[PDB]
Amino acid sequence: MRRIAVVGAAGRMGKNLIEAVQQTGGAAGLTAAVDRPDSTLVGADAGELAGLGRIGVPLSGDLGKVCEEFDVLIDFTHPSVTLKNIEQCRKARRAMVIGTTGFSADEKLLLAEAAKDIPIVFAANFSVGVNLCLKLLDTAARVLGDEVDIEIIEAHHRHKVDAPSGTALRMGEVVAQALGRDLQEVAVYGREGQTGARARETIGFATVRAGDVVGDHTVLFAAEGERVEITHKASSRMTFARGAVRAALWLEGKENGLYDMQDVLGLR
Amino acid sequence: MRRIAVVGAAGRMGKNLIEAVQQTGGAAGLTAAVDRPDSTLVGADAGELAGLGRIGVPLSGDLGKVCEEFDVLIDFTHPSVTLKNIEQCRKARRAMVIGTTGFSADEKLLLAEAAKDIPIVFAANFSVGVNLCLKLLDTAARVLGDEVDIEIIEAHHRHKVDAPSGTALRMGEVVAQALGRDLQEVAVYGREGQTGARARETIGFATVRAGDVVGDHTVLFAAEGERVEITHKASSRMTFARGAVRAALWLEGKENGLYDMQDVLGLR
Amino acid sequence: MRRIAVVGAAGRMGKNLIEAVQQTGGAAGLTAAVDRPDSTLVGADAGELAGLGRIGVPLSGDLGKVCEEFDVLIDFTHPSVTLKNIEQCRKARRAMVIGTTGFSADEKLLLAEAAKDIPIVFAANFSVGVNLCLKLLDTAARVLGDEVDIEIIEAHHRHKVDAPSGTALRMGEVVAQALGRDLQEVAVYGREGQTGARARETIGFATVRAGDVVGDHTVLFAAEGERVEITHKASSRMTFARGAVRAALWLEGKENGLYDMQDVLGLR
Amino acid sequence: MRRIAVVGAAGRMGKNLIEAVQQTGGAAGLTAAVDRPDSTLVGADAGELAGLGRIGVPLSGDLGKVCEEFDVLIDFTHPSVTLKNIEQCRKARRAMVIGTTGFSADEKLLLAEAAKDIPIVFAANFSVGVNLCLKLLDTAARVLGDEVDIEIIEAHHRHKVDAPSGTALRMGEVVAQALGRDLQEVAVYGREGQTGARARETIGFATVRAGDVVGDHTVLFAAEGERVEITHKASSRMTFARGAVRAALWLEGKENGLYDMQDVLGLR
Ligand SMILES: NC(=O)c1ccc[n+]([C@@H]2O[C@H](COP(=O)([O-])OP(=O)(O)OC[C@H]3O[C@@H](n4cnc5c(N)ncnc54)[C@H](O)[C@@H]3O)[C@@H](O)[C@H]2O)c1
Ligand SMILES: NC(=O)c1ccc[n+]([C@@H]2O[C@H](COP(=O)([O-])OP(=O)(O)OC[C@H]3O[C@@H](n4cnc5c(N)ncnc54)[C@H](O)[C@@H]3O)[C@@H](O)[C@H]2O)c1
Ligand SMILES: NC(=O)c1ccc[n+]([C@@H]2O[C@H](COP(=O)([O-])OP(=O)(O)OC[C@H]3O[C@@H](n4cnc5c(N)ncnc54)[C@H](O)[C@@H]3O)[C@@H](O)[C@H]2O)c1
Ligand SMILES: NC(=O)c1ccc[n+]([C@@H]2O[C@H](COP(=O)([O-])OP(=O)(O)OC[C@H]3O[C@@H](n4cnc5c(N)ncnc54)[C@H](O)[C@@H]3O)[C@@H](O)[C@H]2O)c1
Ligand SMILES: [Cl-]
Ligand SMILES: [Cl-]
Numbered sequence A, B, C, D: 001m002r003r004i005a006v007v008g009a010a011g012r013m014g015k016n017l018i019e020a021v022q023q024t025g026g027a028a029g030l031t032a033a034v035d036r037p038d039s040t041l042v043g044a045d046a047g048e049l050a051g052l053g054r055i056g057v058p059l060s061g062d063l064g065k066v067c068e069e070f071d072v073l074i075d076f077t078h079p080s081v082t083l084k085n086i087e088q089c090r091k092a093r094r095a096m097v098i099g100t101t102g103f104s105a106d107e108k109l110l111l112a113e114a115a116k117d118i119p120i121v122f123a124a125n126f127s128v129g130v131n132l133c134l135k136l137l138d139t140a141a142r143v144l145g146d147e148v149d150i151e152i153i154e155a156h157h158r159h160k161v162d163a164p165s166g167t168a169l170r171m172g173e174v175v176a177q178a179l180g181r182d183l184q185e186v187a188v189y190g191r192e193g194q195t196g197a198r199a200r201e202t203i204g205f206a207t208v209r210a211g212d213v214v215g216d217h218t219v220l221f222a223a224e225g226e227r228v229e230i231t232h233k234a235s236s237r238m239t240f241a242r243g244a245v246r247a248a249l250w251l252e253g254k255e256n257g258l259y260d261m262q263d264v265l266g267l268r
Helices: A012-022 A079-091 A105-114 A128-147 A166-178 A238-250 B012-022 B079-091 B105-114 B128-147 B166-178 B238-250 C012-022 C079-091 C105-114 C128-147 C166-178 C238-250 D012-022 D079-091 D105-114 D128-147 D166-178 D238-250
Strands: A002-007 A028-034 A072-075 A095-098 A119-122 A149-156 A203-209 A215-223 A226-234 A257-259 B002-007 B028-034 B072-075 B095-098 B119-122 B149-156 B203-209 B215-223 B226-234 B257-259 C002-007 C028-034 C072-075 C095-098 C119-122 C149-156 C203-209 C215-223 C226-234 C257-259 D002-007 D028-034 D072-075 D095-098 D119-122 D149-156 D203-209 D216-223 D226-234 D257-259
Touching (some): A012 A028, A012 A238, A072 A079, A072 A238, A079 A095, A079 A105, A095 A238, A105 A119, A119 A238, A128 A166, A128 A215, A128 A238, A149 A166, A149 B203, A166 A215, A203 B149, A203 B203, A226 D128, B002 B012, B012 B028, B012 B238, B072 B079, B079 B095, B079 B105, B095 B238, B119 B238, B128 B166, B128 B215, B128 B226, B128 B238, B128 C226, B166 B215, C002 C238, C012 C028, C012 C238, C028 C238, C072 C079, C079 C105, C095 C238, C105 C119, C119 C238, C128 C166, C128 C226, C149 D149, C166 C203, C166 C215, C203 D149, D002 D012, D012 D238, D028 D238, D072 D238, D079 D105, D105 D119, D119 D238, D128 D166, D128 D216, D128 D226, D128 D238, D166 D203
Parallel strands (some): A002 A072, A072 A095, A095 A119, A119 A257, B119 B257, C002 C028, C002 C072, C072 C095, D002 D028, D002 D072, D072 D095, D119 D257
Antiparallel strands (some): B149 B215, B215 B226, B226 C226, C215 C226, D149 D216
């Protein structure tokens, strides 16, 4: 089977990753789990810590002591940690799946550099469903062309501070690019009063903020006689964990390089 | 059976009214149809003109010519026309259903003045479903109270000039009044950038403009653990015609006065 | 403030109840938390156990030792436990909110008996949104009458063994009763092949089983020209916890008796 | 401009085709309109008959009379009629768009035989959105694989006789073929009682019959953490007419052969 290590294992995503690894059924197995060296959770069973049954893998504090018991490392931590993990995995010639965000430009260049020596999957969004939708949106925009009005409707919980969501904006950009438009020029984010007849080129954003919604995204393509909607509904962050594990498996037998979920899903 | 006349019978709502009347299964029947005396369609069968089979009712040009041949007049024309229609019905002591919009405050007083002598149903919206939703919203808002975020999502076709719709704003007003809020003070019509966390008092409007959508309206009430949605979808203007016909039957036996659809539907 | 005890505090619902109590903001406060006497969690902070900050209330093993530090007891345990709690609360003249399910008929009679001496809220479903929807459905069915086709669409996760859900069936019964129909006679649960034109009286159930869906419920009322949909979407069991806490507060100053959520919500 | 003739011009699709042709912004124009020689509508303007302004094209009764006045014939009539239409177009060497349904396997061979001499677009469904969705479904199914539960939810009006729709079954077949399943073996059309936990291979159909719904189709792909939905909503039969007109323009310059909408839309 595929031997998978998880670093940041005691974290929110790390716990989800442990779970998604066990849910592959002998395709993969957890062989290592690493968190902070100064963590009082060090020594505890990684399975128990994630709310699962006892797996038989203790939480350890140093990737170096276990750096040879795995085939691939999945990393959802913090840039300063991932850089150190990159170093150890590169030296040990082990593949990586990196979900950590917030890398600086210089920190990013290190990723491509390490990708000379090891195969890496690096993605800002590991959701299989979201990445699939991004491809479907490109196909739909190209087929439907300038016949349709395109509107992006999203809902998120009452605590979200940014609107529209990063995902909605990305969907907007996919559509804009497919139709040769500049999103920033044609985007509308609200409507109040006498707005007038809709321009065909407009990409409209209707944004709902309410309750505890994890994240709903719909792109509507509407013309006379018909509507097409492509919709993603998230219920938890397990979607990112499952996509990371898929990436970890996909990496088996792959040439050195820097890949993303479009590669993993065969959508590029 | 109930003898129904339709004025503005060649118009958009007029044609729908003819169809809605004929569809009553024999409870009612069309006995007169009037449009402009100006009309080139004068003489043509009312059924044929509405795309139905021949009904046996020619399109008349003068309400006065057929004044003594109907129990109730349904009027979807124009304020100037209705004000004249009213005086004729008032003198002939005939009941009216008035769907015409755009009356001044003074003219409404004139309608009421006439309603002293005849029963009249006068409503800004004759859709049974929309008026029902207005009542359901008041109930929902009172029960859920300040615990929920309330968002009003609507979609209309690409040629609609005003946003949010009059129906969406009315839904807004119903919820605001139930919760003791000033809609103008708490309404939000768009979201862009760092809007920050949502204030509970906010009534948000997310408005979609696209394709040929006749009119979709949803009110979302959201809190931790659950969403409640009250939704109306219009497929054609037949919804208003059917509601007007329901009013015309309801008027039978009613004492003089000025009524609305909340009276007709018993929602008051 | 309102002093609230929670029994079954270490359980799934008990943990949610602790959380919903703290989320009232001085309207209520947790003063006691009881679970199994033989629990090794006894002594631990009820707040910490539920994943919250330290509340200052230890988990105890016996309601009797604390039976006077609270105004109302919320109980989500098991019938054999609740019966004992009923006894202690009755003697101490303390109100109760009972969410425990699975009572036998004889066990139920004890509830009504205790309700001679104390005020009790007892409900099979403590969700405010679901109970609200049940009332809205009655209003809608009565207003729309035999003009509409009524269809109940629900979705639940891939592990649910019963179809349609208990909630969908209850919604079906509300509608059936409102229109004077027998649900069992008019219900349809699937459609395959040449089913023919739809009978107006039919109440249709379209049931989706997929993924991890917690529970979506929609009642569609459809006629020519329009659709009305009343929809409840659950995201977690916190909805039941929040409704129980509302009941606990509602009980303040109430006469002895047996109440349900229709009373709490003022919908009866 | 492209010279388009419509046969069955007085029919339901015929009228829609006339409108769709006139709406092309001058890319195309109607030059002939044929219905039964039997027709009482013979002589009437094609625009007027379709509820449009006078177009200047009288309804003809014989395809042979106008055989040399169009580049492409759009045919939505009846198999017996189309088989004759084909031989005339074949001899006049005129391209065809055939929307007529209900051909035998032998007659399809005859269509192909004719397609040896003229270019023909022949499709069971001319909606651009529906055909697009068929392609998106194949992509979605291949990417998501055996990880998801796949459910097909559709709604149609109260007079539709067959369930699920032909479009829903086709969507079922697309997904089944992508995943190497036998649709007949894995399809489920209803759920009642203790159905038990869902098998992953199952393709579920939840079918709604209600009101005047022209046709809503949704395919849900669900797994832990996320739902993906691909949705088509038809508002009128204009969707098929617009697609047929797109095909008629696409045919310009095409070599002889038998084409479908996957060719027209480049989805192959
Ligand atoms: N790409 C995606 O799809 C996606 C999705 C969700 C989150 N993220 C990113 O994943 C990262 C983690 O998110 P989280 O919410 O899981 O944060 P979190 O803080 O819950 O978990 C982070 C873990 O890193 C551990 N950690 C810190 N220093 C360490 C070290 N030196 N060695 C090992 N472990 C160490 C912390 O102890 C903690 O357990 C963030 O960058 C977040 O943006 C990416
Ligand atoms: N209350 C509602 O629910 C509702 C819904 C839709 C429309 N409306 C209102 O209905 C009215 C008409 O709507 P429409 O879209 O049918 O417009 P329309 O212009 O198609 O119909 C107007 C008809 O009135 C006829 N008319 C004009 N002067 C006349 C006269 N002196 N005597 C007789 N007929 C005369 C015109 O010839 C035309 O046929 C507008 O005020 C619109 O706002 C109300
Ligand atoms: N009415 C509703 O809306 C609603 C909603 C959800 C669950 N429920 C009902 O709530 C009950 C609990 O559900 P759960 O899923 O929370 O089960 P759970 O088993 O997670 O929690 C039950 C708790 O009861 C505790 N318990 C057992 N014996 C006890 C005793 N003698 N004294 C004190 N505590 C004791 C157990 O230790 C456990 O912590 C069940 O009857 C379930 O059907 C009702
Ligand atoms: N492929 C698609 O996407 C699609 C969509 C809708 C309908 N259809 C098919 O289109 C066909 C017609 O659909 P409709 O609903 O428009 O039916 P319809 O009967 O309204 O139209 C039929 C028309 O054909 C005319 N006709 C009959 N014999 C004729 C002849 N010998 N010469 C000329 N005209 C003649 C009739 O007079 C009538 O006007 C059916 O086969 C239907 O299945 C296909
Ligand atoms: Cl109500
Ligand atoms: Cl694709």
